[PDB]
């Protein structure tokens, strides 16, 4: 029986707790149930023996980057997220969290993943992105960033469908395992 | 059979069903079925009629002694089927038959023997506890006893909800899922083209009898906590209010859907219509 | 003392008897006088009087704990006695009050251990049958 510490950075302008929450719920899509608190946990078995372990939600303020590095010790792995639909997202992880998160655990695995899959290739998304002059950026470049770091894995998902959902949390659990 | 009291072919029935489980290693489910038959017979010592006694081996054998030897197979099922609480509880009775009855006090110490260990493996050891799922049966194309009917699951210690779904994905054709996950729909009430839905529900705690107050420790109510279970609730959220940004819970009202099903978790089967 | 209930120098002698019996190793007798000691008490958690409370360890000793160990050592006594029927009597409600009041499971384990240890004995070895004889004081 063992744990497993796991950190989520990212804005707050994509709301990856849901996605977390949905997940640990095993919710049906389009229907969790937002808590008052953060840092879910949940014990799951990926193969052989079933773990234990714990997302830390990590509020994805600029100022709290005073508290956030201290979770940061001693996490088996760490998840790096941002918005598949937001190139400010982009522009935040290549300049903000991926340097600065790079930093503070040079030597831990890492796993980017994508988010808003569904709205990746959302027409009215796509034609909103393009009006505001924003690019609905898609995966050949994420993979280009994941190469960039080297990423253990890259992976796209989304949250009213949790496509690849679980398999992003297995290939988290695995990266330990 | 059960309705028609034809018991012989019934027990016949019932052991094809062992045979099943054993094939499974649903050993809890094995050891309910065996014991079904077992209630049949009495401590009484006469063996009343020749229709208990099945093909597996045919001589005199008091009911006792049947008994007894169903008793033994049961425990050890429950021992290897890790749910050791019904295996303590028979062995109370079957102590207290030995003690009684045929004063074997040899039996009664390999017995207790084995009573000692299944407390020791409780108290010492944890269980994985497992995940239960609501199936929604919609359509037409569906067996008469399957169509527009609603089944809980009870799934392995770990699975996730489309784990179980992909499972059952493979038990059928037409596999596909409706999205109004909570409410039926009415035309594939009537529609062909089975449809199907799966979501788990919340194992709705029991109440351990006589244990309302008594700091007993966890490992007994996390064992009751989905084992021995016939209660399920399903939450439901919804927007009740208005849409403030900053705040959800301005809008937060769920509609909780509670099943009651007919027989209590785990059982000869590892599912359930609701009830 | 029984006639006058002034009960607790009555267990004082109890206690003294208890001595007795042991320099004599009449763990039969010895056991039925501490069990008239803890027939006294109940299976309540509030130790009521300080009176059971005797001099041999004192401090708070819920009712419930003092007759644990009380029924432990007749339990043991009995064994040791080689009178093994009573012992599973007794161990009876022990294992009762384990699995209802205290619920620690280990000791049930250990109880129950013992119990069958006492049926194996009993249907093995055999006891011999002691005589009794009258006596007339005249």
């Given at each position: 029986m063992?744990?497993i510490?796991?950190?989520?950075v990212?804005?707050?302008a994509?709301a990856?707790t849901?996605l977390l929450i949905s997940?640990?719920?095993?919710?049906?899509?389009?229907?969790y149930?937002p808590?008052?608190?953060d840092?879910y946990?949940?014990?799951?078995?990926?193969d052989g023996?079933?773990?234990?372990?714990?997302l830390?939600?990590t509020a994805?303020?600029?100022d709290?980057?005073?508290?956030?590095?201290?979770?940061?010790?001693?996490?088996?792995?760490?998840?790096i997220?941002?918005?598949?639909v937001?190139?400010?997202?982009?522009?935040?992880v290549?300049?903000?969290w991926?340097?600065e998160?790079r930093?503070?655990?040079?030597?831990?695995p890492?796993?980017?993943?994508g988010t808003?899959?569904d709205?990746?290739?959302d027409?009215?998304?796509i034609?909103?992105?393009?009006?505001?002059?924003?690019?609905p950026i898609?995966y050949?470049?994420?993979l280009?960033?994941?190469?960039?770091?080297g990423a253990?894995?890259?992976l796209?998902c989304?949250?009213?469908?949790?496509?690849?959902?679980?398999?992003v949390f297995?290939?988290?659990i695995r990266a330990?395992? | 059979?059960?309705?028609k009291?034809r018991?012989d072919?019934?027990?016949?029935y019932?052991?094809?069903?062992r045979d099943?489980?054993?094939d499974?290693?649903?050993?809890?489910?094995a050891?309910?079925?065996?014991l079904?038959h077992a209630?049949l017979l009495?401590?009484?010592?006469?063996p009343?009629?020749?229709?208990?006694?099945?093909?597996d081996?045919?001589?005199v054998?008091?009911?006792?002694?049947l008994?007894e030897?169903?008793?033994?197979?049961?425990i050890?099922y429950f021992?290897?089927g890790?749910?050791?609480?019904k295996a303590i509880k028979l062995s109370k009775?079957?102590?207290e038959?030995?003690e009684?009855?045929?004063?074997?006090?040899?039996?009664l110490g390999?017995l207790l023997?084995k009573?000692a260990?299944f407390?020791?493996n409780?108290?010492?050891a944890?269980?994985?506890?497992?995940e239960?799922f609501?199936?929604g049966?919609?359509?037409?194309?569906?067996?008469?006893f399957?169509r527009n009917?609603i089944?809980?699951?009870?799934?392995?210690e770990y699975?996730?909800?489309?784990?179980f779904?992909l499972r059952?994905?493979?038990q059928?054709?037409?596999?596909?899922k409706?999205?109004?996950?909570?409410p039926?729909?009415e035309?594939?009430?009537?529609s062909?083209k089975?449809?199907?839905?799966?979501?788990t529900?919340?194992?709705?705690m029991?109440?351990p009898?006589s244990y309302k107050?008594?700091?007993v420790?966890?490992?007994?109510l996390?064992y009751?906590?989905?084992?021995?279970?016939?209660?399920?609730?399903?939450?439901?959220?919804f927007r009740k209010?208005?849409?403030d940004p900053?705040?959800?819970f301005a809008?937060?009202?769920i509609?909780?859907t509670?099943?009651?099903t007919?027989?209590?978790?785990?059982?000869?089967?590892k599912?359930?219509?609701?009830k």
């Open positions: 063992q744990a510490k796991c950190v989520v990212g804005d707050g994509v990856k849901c997940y640990t719920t095993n919710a049906f899509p389009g229907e149930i808590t008052v608190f840092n946990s949940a014990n799951v078995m990926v023996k079933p773990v234990n372990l714990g830390w939600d994805g303020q600029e709290y980057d005073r508290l956030r590095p201290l979770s940061y010790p001693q996490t088996d792995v760490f998840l997220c941002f918005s598949l937001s190139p400010a997202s982009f522009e935040n290549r300049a903000k991926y340097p998160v930093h503070h655990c040079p030597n831990t890492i796993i980017l993943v808003k899959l709205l990746r290739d027409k009215d998304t034609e909103k992105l393009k009006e505001k002059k924003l690019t898609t050949p470049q994420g280009a960033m994941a190469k960039e770091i253990v894995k890259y796209e989304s949250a009213l469908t949790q496509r690849g959902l679980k398999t297995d290939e988290a330990v395992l | 059979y059960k309705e009291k018991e072919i019934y027990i016949r019932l052991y094809k069903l099943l489980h054993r499974c290693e649903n050993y809890t489910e050891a309910y079925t065996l079904l209630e009495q401590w009484s010592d006469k009343c009629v020749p229709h208990l006694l099945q093909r081996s045919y001589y054998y008091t009911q006792q002694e008994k030897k169903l008793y033994q197979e049961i050890s021992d290897k890790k749910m050791w609480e009775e079957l102590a038959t030995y009684s009855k045929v004063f074997d006090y040899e039996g390999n023997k009573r260990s407390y020791e409780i108290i010492k944890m269980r994985p506890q497992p239960y609501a199936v049966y919609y359509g037409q194309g569906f067996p008469s399957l009917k089944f809980i699951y009870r799934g392995k699975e996730r909800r489309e784990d779904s059952l994905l493979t059928f054709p037409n596999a596909e409706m999205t109004s996950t909570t039926p729909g035309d594939i009430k009537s062909p089975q449809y199907m839905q799966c979501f529900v919340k194992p709705v029991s109440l009898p107050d008594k700091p420790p966890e490992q007994i996390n009751y906590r989905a084992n021995e279970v016939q209660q399920f609730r399903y939450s439901r959220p209010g208005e849409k900053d705040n959800e809008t937060m009202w509609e909780r509670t099943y009651t007919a027989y209590t978790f785990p059982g000869i089967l599912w359930f219509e609701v």
